[PDB]
């Protein structure tokens, strides 16, 4: 390692290198193996319907032009060498905005091997679209994907595959999403046909199951508590008009306020969610409580109060428990 022979070798690897031409131009296609090391998934936004992903993206191919003899060890060159080499035109099809980290330097790896093999690594943060089905929200289970494709070259010129097969993607255990948990992940390889031709594609899919604890602590519990507060009106004597109507008006106002607060933090989807069904059920329950008091007031003075009051007291908890049981069995 006199360090001048290395410079000569690297120089004559270049000096006749055309970056405009892929390896084996006009020959068989270049096989580019790919592997990913996931660092984290920072965000999963229902409003924007996308997720942010940070990863180490490693591509691996062979270029006979970059073959050297002599030096029997792998050359870990400076990342700037990547500017003077052909690299695959890989891109993420469903990305919305992505960048390569650039502090302190451009986070790039170039590693050559004596047989012309090239290992090219990047550190990429990317926001990727993920259409979500919120019909069963918040007891929903989403499928998100990252689609890797060649922009310029068809299958006649380039081919993609996963290095190590199912072991190509690592770091799935590193994900720490407070709202979600990754049930499963999958790798797929295929060819997609366009007007211009057939292009390679790789797909990395994740299945995310949402955690229900936050919505138990936020949505369901206040609704149940307000419904019970509505039930409290039945125990008060019938003659207390102000006391008995106050409970009804505050229950319905609180339920509507909960509805607005809940619906003003999600996309304006046109269909009904599970949370909407439960919320409307609780609303009609407090509504029936208020109308029960109104009907009693109409019956007694201004037209048995004890019998109907006792019947309401025994039946309302039973009916609400039955409704909750039916709902929770339906959505679980």
């Amino acid at each position: 390692g006199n360090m001048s022979f290395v410079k000569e070798t690297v120089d004559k690897l270049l000096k006749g290198y055309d970056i405009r031409l892929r390896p084996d131009f006009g020959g068989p296609p270049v096989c580019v193996g790919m592997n990913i090391d996931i660092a984290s998934i920072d965000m999963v936004s229902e409003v924007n319907m996308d997720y942010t992903l940070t990863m180490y993206f490693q591509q691996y191919w062979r270029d006979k032009r970059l073959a050297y003899s002599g030096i029997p060890l792998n050359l870990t060159l400076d990342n700037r060498v990547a500017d003077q080499l052909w690299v695959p035109d890989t891109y993420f099809l469903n990305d919305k905005k992505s960048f390569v980290h650039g502090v302190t330097v451009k986070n790039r790896m170039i590693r050559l091997h004596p047989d012309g093999t090239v290992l090219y690594g990047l550190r990429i943060t990317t926001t990727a679209a993920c259409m979500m089905d919120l019909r069963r929200y918040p007891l929903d289970e989403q499928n998100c994907t990252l689609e890797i494709e060649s922009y310029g070259y068809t299958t006649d010129d380039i081919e993609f595959y996963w290095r190590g097969g199912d072991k190509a993607v690592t770091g799935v255990e590193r994900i720490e999403l407070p709202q979600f948990s990754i049930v499963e992940h999958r790798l797929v390889s295929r060819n997609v046909v366009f007007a211009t031709g057939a292009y390679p594609r790789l797909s990395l899919s994740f299945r995310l199951k949402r955690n229900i604890g936050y919505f138990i602590l936020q949505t369901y519990m206040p609704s149940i508590l307000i419904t019970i507060l509505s039930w409290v009106s039945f125990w008060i004597n019938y003659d207390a008009s102000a006391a008995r109507v106050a409970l009804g008006i505050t229950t319905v106002l609180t339920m509507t306020t909960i509805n607005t607060h809940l619906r003003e933090t999600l996309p304006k989807i046109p269909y009904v969610k599970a949370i909407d069904m439960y919320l409307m059920g609780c609303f009609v329950f407090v509504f029936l409580a208020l109308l029960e008091y109104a009907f009693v007031n109409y019956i007694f003075f201004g037209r048995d109060v004890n019998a109907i009051d006792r019947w309401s007291r025994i039946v309302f908890p039973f009916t609400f428990s039955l409704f909750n049981l039916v709902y929770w069995l339906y959505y679980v």
Partner: nanobody, 108 residues
Amino acid sequence: GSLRLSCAASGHTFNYPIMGWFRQAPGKEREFVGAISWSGGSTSYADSVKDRFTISRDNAKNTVYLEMNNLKPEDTAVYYCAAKGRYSGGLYYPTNYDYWGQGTQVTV
């Protein structure tokens, strides 16, 4: 000649929004008849069958209806319905479609 084919889909219909009708004549290559989107029914047609065949989406029974008008003898073939993923590219290419129906024969 007022055939109204109906393709019913079950399962993970969300992951495969676009639906498409294909036609295979006796001893001839599969060809693209039409395509319908998800939640809005934005429709695309082949040049041969424009303004003669129509496709509609229900989104309640999860069915797609292909209504056939101005029938011709050349419209004698096996008709399939197939689903396509969100990122597959191209409507006219059968290989982009993942799932296929058995096929209904039409001789009228």
